[PDB]
Every structure is written in C-alpha cells, then in structure tokens.
Amino acid sequence: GPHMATGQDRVVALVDMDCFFVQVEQRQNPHLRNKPCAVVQYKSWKGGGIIAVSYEARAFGVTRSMWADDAKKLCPDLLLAQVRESRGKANLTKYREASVEVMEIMSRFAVIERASIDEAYVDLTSAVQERLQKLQGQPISADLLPSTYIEGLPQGPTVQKEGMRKQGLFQWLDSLQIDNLTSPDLQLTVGAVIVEEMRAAIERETGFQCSAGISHNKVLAKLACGLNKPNRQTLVSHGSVPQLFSQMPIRKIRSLGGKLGASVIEILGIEYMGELTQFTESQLQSHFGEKNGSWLYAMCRGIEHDPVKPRQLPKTIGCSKNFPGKTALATREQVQWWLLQLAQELEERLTKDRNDNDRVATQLVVSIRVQGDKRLSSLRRCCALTRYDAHKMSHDAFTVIKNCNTSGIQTEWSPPLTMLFLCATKFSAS
DNA sequence: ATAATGACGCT
DNA sequence: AGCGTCAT
Ligand SMILES: Cc1cn([C@H]2C[C@H](O)[C@@H](COP(=O)(O)NP(=O)(O)OP(=O)(O)O)O2)c(=O)[nH]c1=O
Ligand SMILES: [Mg+2]
Ligand SMILES: [Mg+2]
C-alpha cells in the first residue's frame, strides 16, 4: 500500500501560446485584433491553406488544414494574414523570432524544454521549494490564482463560468495543507502561482496570451493545458486522475494519438485511459512491447517519468517544400533551382544561428519524395556540412540524390519530385 | 492539392 | 545510417 510509487515527486508545467501565429499577426496589425482571423500560406490554390485560427473564427467552424475559400463559406467576415514568402517558399521567421521572445521570458523563472515553436515544458520543482520557504507557512490566496482552474472541482452539495471557476478554486484551497512543504497538492498549487506570474510577464512583455497546465509530469501538464484554453491555466492533481481518465479517450494522451493508441483501443477492446488499470504490466508488455507496456502501466495511473530536458534551442535546422500535383519537379534545371533556393534560406538561418547561439552544424541531411511513392519520404542521405554556403550545400545535395534520377535522358528528372528537404544537424560549440 | 517543420524510436 | 512515428 505505502509501497506503490505514486509519481508526485515533480512539478511540471506546459505553457502553450493561444493561436500563436494569429496572435503574432494581430500584434503587428491591430485591425485583426478581437475578430475572426486565420493565418494562411499560399493564396493560389483555393485561397490558401489555413494553419492558425483565432478563437472567434473557431466559433464559426474554421479549422487548420482548411482551404481559405472553404473557410469563407462558414465565416464570410473572416480576416486573413498570409505567411511571408521568400525564394518561392513559405518562410516562418517572424514566428520563430516571436517564439524566442516568449521562451526567453519563460527561461527567467525556470529551465524550459522547447517542445514546438509555441510551447515549452517547465520543471518548477526547485522554484516551488523556494517560494514555499519564502511563504513561512501562510495560506495561499485566490487572488494569487486569478485564471486558474482546478480539474474535477467543484463537486458536491453559480451557473456562469467565472463563478464556477472560483467555487472549485475555493474548494481546492479550503482543503489545502499549507504547513506541509512536501504535500504534493500544495506543491502543485504553488507551481500554478508561479505560472500565473510567468504568464503575466509573457503578456506584459510581448502582448501574447497563453494557456498552461500544471501537474506532476509532461503528459498531464499538456493534457491539463487544453482543458481551459484560451487565456487560462489548469491544475491537474494526482487525485483527479481517475475521474478524468475514466472518460478520457486514449487518443488524447500525447503519443497515443496514432497507430499505437489505435491498437490499444483495438487489441484491448477499450476506449478510455482508465480501463488500462485492469491490465497487469506483463500483460501490456506482451501486447505492446517492453517500454510501451511499462509506460502504459504507469501512465493510466497518472505516473510518467520523462524529464524536462534543459533544451531551449532546436537540434536541427531544416527547410522543405512540397511540389504537389503537376508542380512536381521534372527537369534537372528545376531540381537544382529549388535546391538552391532552399539552401539559401538554410544558409541565412545557419549564419543567424551561429552568431546567436555560438555553434556550428556539421552534417547536411538531404531528403526527397518522388511522385507515386506512397511514403512521405522516399530517401534521406547525410553528407558532410563544412561551409555555410548555399551553392556548395545545394551542389552537395544534388550529387547525394542525382542517382535517384531514373530518366533515360540527361536533362529530365523522372519520376517527378514531390518534396525536397534540406536539414542541418549535428551541432558543435563555436 | 495541407504544408512546414522538429523530436525521438527501431534496426 | 536510413527509415518511421507522432507531434504542432
Ligand atoms: C498544429 C499545427 C500548428 N502549426 C503552427 C501555427 C500554430 O499556431 C503554431 C502553434 O501550434 P498549436 O499550439 O498546436 N496551435 P495554436 O497555438 O494556433 O492554437 P491553440 O491556442 O494552442 O489551441 O502551430 C502548424 O504550422 N502546423 C500544425 O500542424
Ligand atoms: Mg498554441
Ligand atoms: Mg502547441
């Protein structure tokens, strides 16, 4: 009983920017603020693919992956901003630079793990200990958690949203043990007070709003973070897991959203995270392998161990472009030209990277897709990266792939190429 | 005819 | 090393 390791040793947060690219455009262009807007890339085919949607536009049914002309059918006052284009391709530099803004602020409170362009995990265990010594042993106010939700509360014996939020918050605080510094519920509560402050600083200093989740691990933090977007944070406690998971679709836990989670549903014949507790670990390892079974056995009990790695900077810098339909690259003049375009954006980013973060890449990864191939990558070969020069890299990339050209003649390329990819990896201090 | 990325796992 | 999974 006492000998069951309950996974409450750490405080972990996930901070995720709300409709990030839309917010980045709305700061630049006031005209777009507090209106239905989407961010699109490439206007030509159907008015553009949408990649980010404001919450106002979401309310009409606009989703990412949508064509902008379909979007205008559900939402005719939709406003659009389009991604920058350079050298024939979408260029995400604005949002990368806006991301650095936000990660840098986050870094002041705690070590962060950049998880994507718009979210980072936080390990607040140490900071919580400090704020807990500072706090003598005094109660925690609800004024210190003005945007926090407590998952599972309220329960027991106001019908409008903000009032409901405070009721759960006061229920949570009315049952706190504020004299016990190793009480994991107190620890979470304190973590969420820091995340209120970290989130105020972000919006104070950037104009960007975010949501967040505060729990004991990365899966729960991520999952908590999406229960009350936008502009809100959510505390998932160890004790709230069994109710939460009893109706939680398996596909919603991170890394179960694909073929693994579909096979858990299909082999086990279940639907919800909580039905995994029935199985023994050995059982789950026979169905799903040694690491997954172990991982699943703890995860359904709300235990996960993957640590917040100290890594604020990407490990790979890549540029890619699809050539869909009858835009597939069929001449070798054509393949060279786009390999050079890509290599010029890669060169400029690598030079900025070196001056920014004092490191040089040593390996260039080339990848193409051919037309009619059913995989998303047909080939991927490495080669040495010794100079940050676009023509050398694109020359090197071409020779690494030139023998994929099966066309009978010299100047053609067959079958036509549907994707090109250049990535810099293997960084070393400079 | 989503598209542009970026991390991590398997052999 | 090259490929595959899952994510955002
Ligand atoms: C999911 C996803 C997002 N993005 C770009 C713009 C998104 O704003 C940036 C951050 O992703 P996110 O947090 O999953 N989506 P969001 O920030 O727009 O919306 P939310 O407020 O977090 O729900 O993702 C893509 O470019 N491809 C994607 O598949
Ligand atoms: Mg976001
Ligand atoms: Mg995100």
Does residue A21 have its Cβ closer than 6 Å to ligand 1? Answer: yes
User: Containing domain of residue A389, as a range?
Assistant: 308-430
The Cα A247–Cα A415 span in angstroms is 48
Q: What is the DSSP letter of A392?
A: H
Q: How many other C-beta atoms can be found within 10 angstroms of the C-beta atom of residue A4? A: 8
CATH number of the domain where residue A71 is located: 3.40.1170.60
Q: Are A97 and A356 in contact (CB under 8 A)?
A: no
Does A302 lie in the same domain as A316?
no
The C-alpha torsion from A42 through A44 and A46 to A47, rounded to 10°, is 60
The C-alpha torsion from A187 through A190 and A194 to A200, rounded to 10°, is 140
Check whether A123 is labelled as a binding-site residue. no
Helix A184-206, helix A125-134: angle, nearest 10: 100
The Cα A430–Cα A424 span in angstroms is 15
Query: Exposure of A301 by Cβ count < 10 A (0-12 exposed, 13-18 middle, 19+ buried)?
Result: buried
Does A100 lie in the same domain as A215?
yes
Resolution in angstroms, to 1 decimal, for this deposition?
Answer: 2.5
Does A243 lie in the same domain as A126?
yes
For A78, residues 6+ apart whose C-beta sits below 8 A from its C-beta are A36, A37, A38, A57, A60, A62, A68, A71, A72
The Cα A368–Cα A28 span in angstroms is 35
Query: Is the C-beta atom of A318 closer than 7 angstroms to strand B?
Result: yes
Task: Check whether the bond before A249 is cis (ω within 30° of 0).
Answer: no
Task: Check whether the bond before A154 is cis (ω within 30° of 0).
Answer: yes
Q: Where is the domain boundary, A291, A307, A323?
A: A307
CA of A52 to the centre of ligand 1 (A): 6
* Residues preceding gaps in chain A (C to N > 2.5 Å): 157
Does A322 lie in the same domain as A231?
no
Q: What angle do CA A97, A98, A102 make, to 5 degrees?
A: 115
Locate all alpha helices (DSSP H) within A180-231, ordered by sequence.
Answer: 184-206, 218-225
The Cα A418–Cα A274 span in angstroms is 43
Q: Please count the structural domains in chain A.
A: 4
Q: How many CA atoms lie within 13 A of A46 on its CB side?
A: 11
Query: Exposure of A53 by Cβ count < 10 A (0-12 exposed, 13-18 middle, 19+ buried)?
Result: buried
Does residue A18 have its Cβ closer than 6 Å to ligand 1? Answer: yes
CA of A255: nearest nucleotide by C1' is C6
Does A357 lie in the same domain as A289?
no
Ligand 1, residues A24, A64, A93: which to mutate, most atoms within 8 A of Cβ? A64
Whats the size of chain A, residue-wise? 430
Does A261 lie in the same domain as A169?
no
For A269, residues 6+ apart whose C-beta sits below 8 A from its C-beta are none
Q: Are A211 and A226 in contact (CB under 8 A)?
A: yes
Secondary structure class of A30 (helix, strand, coil): helix
Does A182 lie in the same domain as A43?
no
A408 CA vs B7 C1’ separation (Å) = 39
CATH number of the domain where residue A216 is located: 3.30.70.270
Q: What is the DSSP letter of A393?
A: H
Which of A290, A287, A285, A256 shows the shortest CA–CA distance to A273? A256
A31, A95, A347 from A63: Cα distances, Å: 21, 19, 34
Concatenated DSSP letters of A235-295: E--GGGHHHHHHT-BGGGSTT-SSHHHHHHHHHHT--BGGGGGGS-HHHHHHHH-HHHHHH
Secondary structure class of A421 (helix, strand, coil): strand
CA A156 to centroid of chain Cα atoms: 36
Query: Is the C-beta atom of A256 closer than 7 angstroms to strand C?
Result: yes
Experimental approach was: X-ray
Q: Which atom number of ligand 1 is nearest to the Cα of residue A65?
A: 29
Which of A355, A345, A362 shows the shortest CA–CA distance to A422? A345
Query: Is the C-beta atom of A362 closer than 7 angstroms to strand C?
Result: no
A314 CA vs B4 C1’ separation (Å) = 15
Q: Which helix (H) or strand (E) holds A422?
A: strand A412-429
Does A230 lie in the same domain as A170?
yes
The Cα A366–Cα A354 span in angstroms is 21
Ion ligand 2: residues, CB within 5 A, are: A 16-17, 20, 118
The Cα A135–Cα A132 span in angstroms is 5
Q: Sheet of A12-17: strands edge to edge?
A: A112-116, A119-123, A12-17, A210-215, A233-235, A148-150
Ligand 1, residues A58, A118, A227, A252: which to mutate, most atoms within 8 A of Cβ? A118
From atom 22 of ligand 1, which residue's Cα is the shortest distance away? A18
A255 CA vs C5 C1’ separation (Å) = 9
Does A103 lie in the same domain as A37?
no
